[PDB]
Amino acid sequence: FYWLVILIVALNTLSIASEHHNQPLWLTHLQDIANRVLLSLFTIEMLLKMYGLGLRQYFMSIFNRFDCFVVCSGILELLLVESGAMTPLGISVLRCIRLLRLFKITKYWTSLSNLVASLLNSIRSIASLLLLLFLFIIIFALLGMQLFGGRYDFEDTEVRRSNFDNFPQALISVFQVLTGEDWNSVMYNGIMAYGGPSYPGVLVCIYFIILFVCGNYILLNVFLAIAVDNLAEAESLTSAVNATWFTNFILLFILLSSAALAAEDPIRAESVRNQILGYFDIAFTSVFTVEIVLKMTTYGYFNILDLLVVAVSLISMVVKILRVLRVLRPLRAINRAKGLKHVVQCVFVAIRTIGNIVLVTTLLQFMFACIGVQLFKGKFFSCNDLSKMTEEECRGYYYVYKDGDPTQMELRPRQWIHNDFHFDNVLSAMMSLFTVSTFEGWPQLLYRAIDSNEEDMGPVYNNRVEMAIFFIIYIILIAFFMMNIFVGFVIVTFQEQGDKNQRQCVQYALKARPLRCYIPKNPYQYQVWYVVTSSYFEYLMFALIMLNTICLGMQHYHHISDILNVAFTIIFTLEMILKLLAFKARGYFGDPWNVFDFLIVIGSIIDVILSEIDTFLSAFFRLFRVMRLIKLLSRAEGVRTLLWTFIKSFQALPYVALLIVMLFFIYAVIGMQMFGKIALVDGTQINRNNNFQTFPQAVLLLFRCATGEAWQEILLACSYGKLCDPESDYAPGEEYTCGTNFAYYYFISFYMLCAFLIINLFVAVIMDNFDYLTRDWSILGPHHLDEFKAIWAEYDPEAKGRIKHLDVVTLLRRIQPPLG
Amino acid sequence: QNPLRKACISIVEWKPFETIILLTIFANCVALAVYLPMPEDDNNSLNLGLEKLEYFFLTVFSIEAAMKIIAYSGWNVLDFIIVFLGVFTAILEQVNVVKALRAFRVLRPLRLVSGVPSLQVVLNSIFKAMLPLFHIALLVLFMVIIYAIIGLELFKGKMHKTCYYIGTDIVATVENEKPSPCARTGSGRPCTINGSECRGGWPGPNHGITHFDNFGFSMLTVYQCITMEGWTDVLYWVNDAIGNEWPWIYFVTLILLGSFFILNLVLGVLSGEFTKEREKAKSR
Amino acid sequence: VFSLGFLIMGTICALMAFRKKRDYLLRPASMFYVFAGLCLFVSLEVMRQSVKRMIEYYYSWSFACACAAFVLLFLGGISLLLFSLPRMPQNPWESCMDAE
Amino acid sequence: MSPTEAPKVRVTLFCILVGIVLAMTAVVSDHWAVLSPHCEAAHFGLWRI
Numbered sequence A: 001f002y003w004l005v006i007l008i009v010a011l012n013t014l015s016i017a018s019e020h021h022n023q024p025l026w027l028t029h030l031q032d033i034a035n036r037v038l039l040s041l042f043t044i045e046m047l048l049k050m051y052g053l054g055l056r057q058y059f060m061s062i063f064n065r066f067d068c069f070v071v072c073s074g075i076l077e078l079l080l081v082e083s084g085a086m087t088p089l090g091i092s093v094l095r096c097i098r099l100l101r102l103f104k105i106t107k108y109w110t111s112l113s114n115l116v117a118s119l120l121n122s123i124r125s126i127a128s129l130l131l132l133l134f135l136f137i138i139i140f141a142l143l144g145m146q147l148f149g150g151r152y153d154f155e156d157t158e159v160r161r162s163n164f165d166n167f168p169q170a171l172i173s174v175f176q177v178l179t180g181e182d183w184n185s186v187m188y189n190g191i192m193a194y195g196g197p198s199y200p201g202v203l204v205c206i207y208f209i210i211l212f213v214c215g216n217y218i219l220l221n222v223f224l225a226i227a228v229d230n231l232a233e234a235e236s237l238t239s240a241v242n243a244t245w246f247t248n249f250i251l252l253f254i255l256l257s258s259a260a261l262a263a264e265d266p267i268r269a270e271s272v273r274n275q276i277l278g279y280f281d282i283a284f285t286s287v288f289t290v291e292i293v294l295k296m297t298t299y300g301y302f303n304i305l306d307l308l309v310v311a312v313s314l315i316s317m318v319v320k321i322l323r324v325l326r327v328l329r330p331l332r333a334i335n336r337a338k339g340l341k342h343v344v345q346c347v348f349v350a351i352r353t354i355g356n357i358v359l360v361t362t363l364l365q366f367m368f369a370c371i372g373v374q375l376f377k378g379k380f381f382s383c384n385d386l387s388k389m390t391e392e393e394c395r396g397y398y399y400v401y402k403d404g405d406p407t408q409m410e411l412r413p414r415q416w417i418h419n420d421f422h423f424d425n426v427l428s429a430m431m432s433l434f435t436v437s438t439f440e441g442w443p444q445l446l447y448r449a450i451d452s453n454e455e456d457m458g459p460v461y462n463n464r465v466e467m468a469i470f471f472i473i474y475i476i477l478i479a480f481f482m483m484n485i486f487v488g489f490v491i492v493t494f495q496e497q498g499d500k501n502q503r504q505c506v507q508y509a510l511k512a513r514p515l516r517c518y519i520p521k522n523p524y525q526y527q528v529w530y531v532v533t534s535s536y537f538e539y540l541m542f543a544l545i546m547l548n549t550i551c552l553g554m555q556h557y558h559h560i561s562d563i564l565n566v567a568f569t570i571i572f573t574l575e576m577i578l579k580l581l582a583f584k585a586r587g588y589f590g591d592p593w594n595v596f597d598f599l600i601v602i603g604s605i606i607d608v609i610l611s612e613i614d615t616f617l618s619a620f621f622r623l624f625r626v627m628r629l630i631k632l633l634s635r636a637e638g639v640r641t642l643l644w645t646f647i648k649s650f651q652a653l654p655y656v657a658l659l660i661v662m663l664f665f666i667y668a669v670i671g672m673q674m675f676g677k678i679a680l681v682d683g684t685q686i687n688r689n690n691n692f693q694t695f696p697q698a699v700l701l702l703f704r705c706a707t708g709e710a711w712q713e714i715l716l717a718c719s720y721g722k723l724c725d726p727e728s729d730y731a732p733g734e735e736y737t738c739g740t741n742f743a744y745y746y747f748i749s750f751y752m753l754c755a756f757l758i759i760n761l762f763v764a765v766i767m768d769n770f771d772y773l774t775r776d777w778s779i780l781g782p783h784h785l786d787e788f789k790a791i792w793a794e795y796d797p798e799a800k801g802r803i804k805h806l807d808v809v810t811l812l813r814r815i816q817p818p819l820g
Numbered sequence B: 001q002n003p004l005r006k007a008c009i010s011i012v013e014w015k016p017f018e019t020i021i022l023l024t025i026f027a028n029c030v031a032l033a034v035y036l037p038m039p040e041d042d043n044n045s046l047n048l049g050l051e052k053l054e055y056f057f058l059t060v061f062s063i064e065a066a067m068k069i070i071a072y073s074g075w076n077v078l079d080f081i082i083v084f085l086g087v088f089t090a091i092l093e094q095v096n097v098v099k100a101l102r103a104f105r106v107l108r109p110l111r112l113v114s115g116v117p118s119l120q121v122v123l124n125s126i127f128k129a130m131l132p133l134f135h136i137a138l139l140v141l142f143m144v145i146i147y148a149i150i151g152l153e154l155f156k157g158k159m160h161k162t163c164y165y166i167g168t169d170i171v172a173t174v175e176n177e178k179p180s181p182c183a184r185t186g187s188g189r190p191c192t193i194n195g196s197e198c199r200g201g202w203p204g205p206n207h208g209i210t211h212f213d214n215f216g217f218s219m220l221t222v223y224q225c226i227t228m229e230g231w232t233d234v235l236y237w238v239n240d241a242i243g244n245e246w247p248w249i250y251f252v253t254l255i256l257l258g259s260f261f262i263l264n265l266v267l268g269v270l271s272g273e274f275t276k277e278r279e280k281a282k283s284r
Numbered sequence C: 001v002f003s004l005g006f007l008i009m010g011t012i013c014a015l016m017a018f019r020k021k022r023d024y025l026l027r028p029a030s031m032f033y034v035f036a037g038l039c040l041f042v043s044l045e046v047m048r049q050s051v052k053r054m055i056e057y058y059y060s061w062s063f064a065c066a067c068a069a070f071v072l073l074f075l076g077g078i079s080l081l082l083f084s085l086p087r088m089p090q091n092p093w094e095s096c097m098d099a100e
Numbered sequence D: 001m002s003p004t005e006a007p008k009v010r011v012t013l014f015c016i017l018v019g020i021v022l023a024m025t026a027v028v029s030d031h032w033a034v035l036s037p038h039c040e041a042a043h044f045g046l047w048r049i
C-alpha cells in the first residue's frame, strides 16, 4: 500500500496542478469529479488502517494525525457544496484548504526529521527572537506613521502606494524597506514630503538609514543564529606533447582563442573586424587540429571535449546553433590546470551535498504557487485608463494628461493589458514567486494583487489589503527561513571538513624569523631618529591627516583650497625629507608604508606643479591627496590585521574566483550571440547603458543582474517582440523579430549559478579565515608572539641570530604573564 | 533608607500586579496603532477619542511610577523617562491653547520588553553580539568617507544639465524614462527628442537628491550605492553627464569593495562569534 | 620634459640598484617610471583635447606609438613595484621587513 | 639579492627600456594628428606643426 498511496497522492497533486484560467469545460468537470473519487479513496484507506493498527496507536504520530483533519475537512466541504455559497473569494478560500493534502509528499522524506526535531525543541527561542523583530517593526511603523503619516499630499497625479497613511500600510512600507527593495524611492518620497533637498528636509533620511542598518543587523543575527544552531544540533544527532612548454603554449592558445571569440561584432554579420576574427579563429583551429593528432599517436573523459570543440570548429571551416556552441573553448582549461579541476570537483561535491533543502524549498514554492493560482487567477488584467473595468469597455481612444495638466492632452488607444508576472497557471505562479524570492519587483506584484477585483475585471484601488499576508508569509518562510538554512548548511558542512593551539604555537616558534629595526649610529642622526620615532610625531601627523581630510570635504559646487593644498604638500614633503635623513634611505624603503608615502607625496608634488603651471597659462591627479588617509591604516592594528587576513585568504583561493570569471565570460558571450541584435531604445531596459552589443556591456549587464537589480525587467526586455537594430541585417518586412524566449532559461540559470558560486566563494574565504575568526583573545595568540618579536627587535637592531646571555634576563620582565 | 513611614505600598508588587501593567501597555500600543494621521491639522471622532484616552494611560503610568519609587536601574529609568515625556507633553498641550514632540510616544512598546525577562536577555545577547563588529564598522565608515570625497572631486556639479523643450522650462522625456543628465558638445549624452535642447539650471536627477554636489549628498549617494539599491541609476546618470569610459571603474570597485567584501567580513565575524558562543556553552 | 626627467631619474635609480647590493632602490625607480608614464598619458590626453577643439582625425602611426609607450611604462613600473615588494605574509609568523 | 637577478625582473626591466626608448623617439615623430579640411593633411605635434 506504500506505492499505492504514493500513486494516489501523485494523482491528487496532478489534479490540483492542472487548474488554470480559462480552462475548458471538460477539464473543470473532470477536476470536480476527480475530487470525489480521491476523497472516497482516502476515506477507504483511513478505515482499513483503523482496524489494521487499532484506534489507540494511530494518534501517537503526527504523521497520521492530520489525515483525519484532511478527510473531515473534505467531507465537510463536499457537504457544504450544495449550499448557497456566494462570495467567489470566499468559496476560493474554502478551495484553499483542499490544498493542505499536499503535505503527503513531504510526509515521505525522513532526512528532514532530524532538523525539524531541533526546530520543535527550539520553537520557544524562535518565537522569542521573531517577537523581538516584530516589536522592532511595530515601533518603526509607528514612528513612520508619526513622521510621514498624512504628509504625502502631493499635487501631482503620481501614485505612491508605499506610504504611512495607516498602520497596515506603514507595516508594509517598513517591511519593504527591511527587505531593501526600492527603499530609496520611499526615502525620496519622505524627503520630498518635507521641504526637499534642504537643510532640515534631508534629515529624515536618518530614519531610513537607521531602519535599514538596524533591521538588517537584527535579521542577520536572528536568522543566522537559528540556522547555524539548529543545523549544528541536527548534524550532532546525525553522527549519533608532455613537456611543460607544449602545455603552456596550448593554454596560451586557449586564452587567445577565448579573447578572439569574446571581442566580436554581433550586430554586423559582414564587417571588417569579423573577417580578421575568422582568420584568427581558423589559424587557432589549425594549431589545435595538429595538437589532437599528436596526442592520440602516443596514447590510446576530458579529451572528448577537445575533440568535440575541434569538430564543431572545423565544421564551420538550426544552422546557427553550432555557432553559439563554440563557447566551450574556455572550458578547455579545466584539464590543464590541476587546481581548476580540483575546485570544479569540489563544487560538484558541494552541489550533490545540498540536495534535500533544494527539493523541499522547491516543493514548498510549488504549494505556494498553487495557493497563489487559487487566489489571483485571472485577476491581473488591466486597461490603459483605470476607468474601463472590462475588456469590452477597454476599446477606442482616451486622453492622457502629461505632468497632470488638464490643458496638455494627448491621445492614446485603449488596450486590455496583462501583467508580465501573473498567477494564471502553476508555471506563471512559480515564475512570479521566484521573482518575489529575489526581492525584485515584489512590491509591484503585492500592490497589483491588493487591487485584484474579479476574474475578468480591472483593479480596484486598495480593494484587498489583507492580500499582503500571502506575500509577507511567503517572504518570511522562503526568502528568509529556508534560504538562511541553505546558507547555514554550507557553513557547517565546510566547518566539518576544516591539541591544535600548542601545535600552532610550536609551529610559530619553529618557523619564526626576526625582523629588522634599523637602530642608527651617528648621534646627530640619532636625534632625528628619536624625534621621528617618538609617538608625539605620529600623533601630530595623524592630526594633520585628519585636518587634511576635513579640508578635503569642505569643497562644494557653487579660492582657499589652493593655498591649503600647497601647505599640506609642503608639510608632507618635509616629512619625506626628515624620514630619508633619519633612515639614510636604506631602511626607509624597506617599509611598504613608506613606499606608499613616497608615491603619494610625489603624486601630490606633481599635482601642485601642474596646478601652478595651469595658473601660469589632469583631473585625476587630484586623487593622490585623497589617498593620504590610506596611510592612517598603519595605526589601527585591528583593522589592518583583519584586512590582511581576509586579503591573504582571497589570494589563497583564486581558482574559486576563476569559476565566477569563467561563468561571466561564457554567459556574456552567449548573451551577445542571443540578444546582441536588440535595438537601443529609451524607455526600455535595453538602451545605451544596458545592452549585449559589446563584451564589456554584456559583462556590466551580468554584473548588474548579479547585484540584484531589476533583472526580471531585463528578462522581459528580451522575448521575441523587440525591434531589431537598424544596422543589423534582417529581411525587409519584418523588424520586430529580435529577442528569444530562451531569455527565461538564460536569466534564471544565471541568477541561480551566480548566487551559488558567490555563496561558495564567501564560505571558502570564511573557512580559510576560521583560525583567526574563532580565536580566544585571552588565553594566547600570535599577537603576543608578534609583540615578543617587536620587543626583541627593540633589544636587537639586526637579526644576527640570538643576543647576549645577560641581556636575556631583562627582557623576560617585559613579557606578559600570559606569555611569561 | 527611610523608616517604615512610607513603605506601606510594597505589598502589591509581589502580587501579579505586573500583568495589569503589561495589559495596559498592550492597550496603549493598540491605541497608538488605530490612530489615523490626517493632513493639515485634520481629525475625526476616533482621533479625538484617543486623545482623551491618552490621559488614562498617563495617570496609570504616573501612579505606578510614584508607587514604585516610594517603596524603593537601567530598565526602570526608561519607564521614568517615558512617563516624564508623556506628562511633559500633556502639560505643554493644554497651556499653548508642537506636534513634533508627540513622536516620543512610540517608545511605549519598549516597556513590553522591559516587562518580560525573556526578551530582556534576548536583547542583551543581541547587543553583546555587536562588539566584535566594531572594526568592520570603522572600515565601512572609512571606505564611505574615501569614496564620498573621490566622488566629490570627480562628479561635482556635473549632473545639472538636462534637455528641456525649445524655449520652455519643461523637461523632455519619453513614456517610461526618468529624467537624466545631458551634455552638449562633449563626451556625454545628447538628447534625441525633436523639439529639445540641452541647457543648465536643472536641480538634479532624483528631484535634486542624487548628486555629488557637497559632502553630505555625496555621502548619501555613496551609502545608497553600497546597499546596491539603485547604484546602476547613479552610474548611468554619471555616464550621461560625462561619458561611459571612466566612471564604471569607480562604481564597480565601490560595489565590489563596500558591498561584497564588507558583507563577507560581517558574515565571517558573525559566524565566528556564533561558533565561539556555541562551543563555550557546550561545556556547560 | 618633466616626464623625461622622471625617466632619467628612474634609469639612474635602476642602474644604481644593481651595484653593491642596493636591492632597495628598485621601488623608487619603478614609481618614477609610473609617474613618467602618467605624465606622458596626460600629455597625450591634452593633445587629443587640442586636436578635438580644432571633419575627422585619424590615428595611424604616432598616436598608437605614444599609447603603447604609456602602457609599457605604466605596466612595467607597476610590475617592478609589485615584484620588488617581498611577499604577502600568508602566515601568522611571517611578516614584512623580516630577515631576508 | 633574490629579486635582483630574477628573470622576471629582467623581463620587466627590458620592457621598461623598450618603452623609454620608444617614448624618447616618439617625442619628435609628430605623426598622430592629421586634419583633412575637405588635400591639406596636416601634421600636428608637441614641438613643431
Ligand SMILES: C#C[C@]1(C)[C@H](O)[C@@H](CO[P@@](=O)(N[C@@H](C)C(=O)OC(C)C)Oc2ccccc2)O[C@H]1n1ccc(=O)[nH]c1=O
Pocket: A179, A180, A216, A217, A219, A220, A439, A479, A480, A483, A484, A487, A706, A707, A708, A754, A755, A758, A759, B263, B267
Ligand atoms: C534575505 C536577505 C538579506 C537582507 C539580503 O537580501 C542577502 C544578500 O545576499 P544573498 O542574497 N546571497 C547571494 C544571492 C549573493 O550573490 O549576494 C548578493 C546578491 C548581495 O542571501 C544571504 C547572504 C548571507 C547570509 C544569509 C542570506 O543577505 C541578507 N543580509 C545582507 C546584508 C546585511 O547587513 N544583513 C542581511 O540580513
Ligand SMILES: CCCCc1oc2ccccc2c1C(=O)c1cc(I)c(OCCN(CC)CC)c(I)c1
Pocket: A351, A358, A361, A362, A437, A438, A439, A479, A480, A483, A708, A752, A753, A755, A756
Ligand atoms: C547548480 C547551482 C544551483 C543553485 C540553487 O538551486 C536552488 C534551488 C532552489 C532554491 C535555491 C537554489 C539555489 C541557490 O543557490 C540560491 C537561490 C536564491 I533565489 C537565493 O536568494 C537570492 C535573493 N536574496 C535577496 C537578494 C533572497 C535571500 C540564494 I542566497 C541562493
Ligand SMILES: [Ca+2]
Pocket: A180, A181, A182, A439, A440, A441, A708, A709, A710, B229
Ligand atoms: Ca532591487
